Amino acid sequence: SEVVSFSFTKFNPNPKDIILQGDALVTSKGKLQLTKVKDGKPVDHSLGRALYAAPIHIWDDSTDRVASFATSFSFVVEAPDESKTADGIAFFLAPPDTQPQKDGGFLGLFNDIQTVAVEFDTFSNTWDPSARHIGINVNSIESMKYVKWGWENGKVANVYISYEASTKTLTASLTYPSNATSYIVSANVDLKSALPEWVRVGFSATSGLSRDHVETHDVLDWSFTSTLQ
Template identity: 35%
Template sequence: MSQLPILFAFLLLAFIPCSTSLTSTFNFSSFTKAQNVTYSGDAFVNSEGNLDLTSTAINKNSTSSAGWAVYDNTIILYDAGAGFSADFQSNFSFEIFPLGANCKGDGLAFFMAPENWTHNAENNGYGLGIFNKSSVANNSQMIAVEFDTYANYFDPSGNHMGIDIGSFNSSTTVNWEPSMENSLNATALIQYNSITGNLSTHLMDRDRSLQWSTSLDVNLRTVLPGKVVMGFSASTGLCSEGHRVKSWSFSVTVPDRTPSPAPNWHPAPNWQPSLT
């Protein structure tokens, strides 16, 4: 039997447009060591199924602590050759809490970075474990949403949420409620719309009585490579606090960019255009 009909069939299928969206999603209602997440530094899963990113033990040094939790599978944000860009949504509940120290810091972050990214924390807590002060070039292809609890000289306050684009100096920030200065128990929602280029982040306290949000327009193709890794990081410097992620869900979807068909308009019988 000739192979030409089979070859022709495969070629024909290759040119049939796909009508379904490319979607990837997961939902971790709690954390286990068996999930597709790699923990490093001081990060660990506690007995309650929560992810602690920095040391929380009273008998262990909780200053100069850093930890990371990185999802094992790479995420495809865009493919220039195939001509698509993806939307994504990351939703997680977390807690930042005091450890009885005289001061608190530094915070935690959700981040995306190139596939070959490796962590390199600095002992003073700078950069929340992802941005490096001594090698600024390594920061350029990264984005993060930070929940910062320590006021550096470039920060608006010691309690703020910010969007970082290739730099630890946030492009946009919003302060959260002063009454939550010592402890933050909240849910965060991060969304990116690849059509409008809008990256937004929303924060809501546990009682759903207080909400904060900020956003900016950014073309992630100009910042990130097409394939990225993502996860959480946190660090402490001379001060200390606990950084705990309780649950995490994520989805990435390629939106349908097929243009709407033109209206199927037909003139009425005997219709004539007006000449006046």
């Protein structure tokens, strides 16, 4: 058996165990700022990602084992105008050598790819439901499952995501501690069929392609654990 685990109550401004991609950076105060901010205001056409340095062993072909993992993180999405926002933030697993994909609605993850993601989508694209949503995505920008999500501008969101290998169940929940509101969605996901044996895990986010569709995507903390046995 193999157990892997880490916790950040904040991020180091010069992170060494975090692989920063695109526009992502850590602020002096220790906030993982995925998308660009200038003069304290979010900028459009931004894409940032952040992955944990050590690959995670999610399934083994020789031993026919699949990992179970659980992760918590808090995140803020703040937009100058509440009615106009894009695009969103996601937690994702992809091959270790994963690089940023397309911007805008593709969230830095997909294009037109072996990526499984839990997205917090703030803009309705062609492949989306009408309302903002939390989605479970399996190798597509189109979610297999989603729940409508009443996004609260600038309010801290607490996320908990778990994968139970014995039942192939991935579950994601978001709670706003400010008004004790919550949402949850689950899906049946076969990690062996969606991903390679080893992955890197982390976050991706992208601001809108227009000036009037901008917002921040900041991660405040992050704890993760995975066991393969």
